Swiss-Prot record:
Lineage: Eukaryota, Metazoa, Chordata, Craniata, Vertebrata
Biased composition annotated in UniProt, kind: Basic and acidic residues: 407-420
Residues modified as Phosphothreonine: 247
Keywords annotated in UniProt: Acetylation, Cell cycle, Cell division, Cell membrane, Centromere, Chromosome, Cytoplasm, Cytoskeleton, Guanine-nucleotide releasing factor, Membrane, Microtubule, Mitosis, Nucleus, Phosphoprotein, Repeat
One GO BP annotation of this record: negative regulation of GTPase activity
Stretches for region Required for interaction with RAC1: 223-230
UniProt subunit comment: Interacts with RAC1. Interacts with nucleotide-free and with GDP and GTP-bound forms of RAC1, with a slight preference for GDP-bound RAC1. Binds preferentially to the nucleotide-free form of RAC1. Interacts with CORO1C. Interacts with microtubules.
Residues included from the entire protein: 90 to 522 of 522
Keyword Cell division carried by entry: yes
Gene Ontology annotations for the cellular component aspect, listed alphabetically: chromosome, centromeric core domain; cytosol; early endosome membrane; microtubule; midbody; mitotic spindle midzone; nucleolus; plasma membrane
Segments for region (Disordered): 407-427
Organism the protein comes from: Homo sapiens (Human)
RCC1 repeats: 14-76, 79-130, 132-182, 184-252, 253-306, 308-352, 353-406
UniProt name for this protein: Protein RCC2
Location in the cell: Nucleus, Nucleolus; Nucleus; Cytoplasm, Cytoskeleton; Chromosome, Centromere
Residues bearing PTM N6-acetyllysine: 3, 35, 204, 282
Length: 427
């Protein structure tokens, strides 16, 4: 009941940003750009192999950020400064307008803050300061910014309406948000569709009774073999990750919970029903078989177990197949997983000394294989364009990849310099 005071450290990563995949920000996930963006119909291109940004010369990056639903990105510099670029129809870049930005740009409205983390939904963004305060910007039609109201676009960063213990982790779904405090309490806000906010209601009346400020996720449950629903008491959340319409939690006992839309098996409970309350993912409740890391993609889920094995469930290819229960990714047997991301369908992993990627067609370059090389791959492939380059962290939007390339040695710096430089035509 004493309010805790935090000073959060940023990521320990340091390197240069590389990008690959789709960079026509207005075209991503669409057959054509919206009529309003017609001038941009040919701005941006599919980058089939990794590129640097010219505008990032001399800029050292500690965090790269996007989200499986997003056509925008952010980065945090080693000074804790937040920059953003990409699609901006709803103000999700935080630059005070709704104008698309081609290349990384410092967010003036947060330049006096030290930012330690950020998260992206379909059309919104959250940013976390070192003191545990959350700023939100972008679409607020469903209350996903947690500002106490509903508005179509909020293009300038605004502190959320929240007076509890300081926040230490965040995640965003397509039209909702999750924030985790320093005590392990979890709060959600935004669109209640599918029960994705975790309060045992879909809020539907088609209209939604949205949660306009952070609401405590009060109950976590398990289902017994007989079908009995039992509360799991005193869950202390340690991490949270979201796809479009689902959420994963990792708690202090190394247990995984999931809830939201059950379609395609993304919740992992050996069935497809929705869960409107966080539900225990049974596999990770066994002694020594808990999870150490969780990740989410657009319609899928991942966990790395205590002993380091990668598990997947849900669908990377909704047009073809889905997995209803956590399944070991045997192709990565014995590999030490450091970072993982997934977009609509593509997966990228930093493991051992490699970067690994795979996914079905269509792709747009986010696998990183390079020009004149295959565009897709059913199974994991080493990303050979990043030979000799160490990926410290990876991130994905719906159709693009971001990595932090370590640049400590001269050998590394030279390898990174050889990569093409992207200086996109402006406006």
């Amino acid at each position: 009941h004493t309010k805790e005071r935090v000073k959060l450290e940023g990521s320990k990563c340091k390197g240069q940003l590389l990008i690959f995949g789709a960079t026509n920000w207005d075209l991503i996930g669409r057959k054509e750009v919206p009529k309003q963006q017609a001038a941009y119909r040919n701005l941006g291109q599919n980058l089939w192999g990794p590129h640097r940004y010219g505008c990032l010369a001399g800029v050292r990056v500690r965090t790269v950020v996007s989200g499986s639903c997003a056509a925008h990105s952010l980065l945090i510099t080693t000074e804790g400064k937040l920059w953003s670029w990409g699609r901006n129809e709803k103000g999700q870049l935080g630059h005070g307008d709704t104008k698309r930005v081609e290349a990384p740009r410092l967010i003036e409205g947060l330049s006096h803050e030290v930012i330690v983390s950020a998260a992206c939904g379909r059309n919104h963004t959250l940013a976390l300061t070192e003191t545990g305060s959350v700023f939100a910007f972008g679409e607020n039609k469903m209350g996903q910014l947690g500002l106490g109201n509903q508005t179509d676009a909020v293009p300038s960063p605004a502190q959320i309406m929240y007076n509890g213990q300081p926040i230490t982790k965040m995640a965003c779904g397509a039209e909702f948000s999750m924030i985790m405090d320093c005590k392990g309490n979890l709060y959600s806000f935004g669109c209640p569709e599918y029960g994705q906010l975790g309060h045992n209601s879909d809020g539907k009346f088609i209209e939604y009774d949205c949660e306009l400020v952070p609401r405590r996720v009060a109950i976590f449950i398990e289902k017994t073999k007989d079908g009995q629903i039992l509360p799991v008491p005193n869950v202390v959340v340690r991490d949270v990750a979201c796809g479009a319409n689902h959420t994963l939690v990792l708690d202090s006992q190394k247990r995984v919970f999931s809830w939201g839309f059950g379609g395609y098996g993304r919740l992992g409970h050996a069935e497809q029903k929705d869960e409107m309350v966080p539900r225990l993912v049974k596999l990770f409740d066994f002694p020594g078989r808990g999870a150490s890391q969780i990740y989410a993609g657009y319609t899928c889920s991942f966990a790395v177990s205590e002993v380091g094995g990668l598990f997947f469930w849900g669908a990377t290819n909704t047009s073809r197949e889905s997995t209803m229960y956590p399944k070991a990714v045997q192709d990565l047997c014995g590999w030490r997983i450091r970072s993982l991301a997934c977009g609509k369908s593509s997966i990228i992993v930093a493991a051992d000394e490699s970067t690994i990627s795979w996914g079905p067609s269509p792709t747009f370059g986010e696998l990183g294989y390079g020009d004149h090389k295959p565009k897709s791959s059913t199974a994991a492939q080493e990303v050979k364009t990043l030979d000799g380059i160490f990926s410290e962290q990876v991130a994905m939007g719906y159709s693009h990849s971001l990595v932090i390339a370590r640049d400590e040695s001269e050998t590394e710096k030279e390898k990174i310099k050889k990569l093409p430089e992207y200086n996109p035509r402006t406006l």
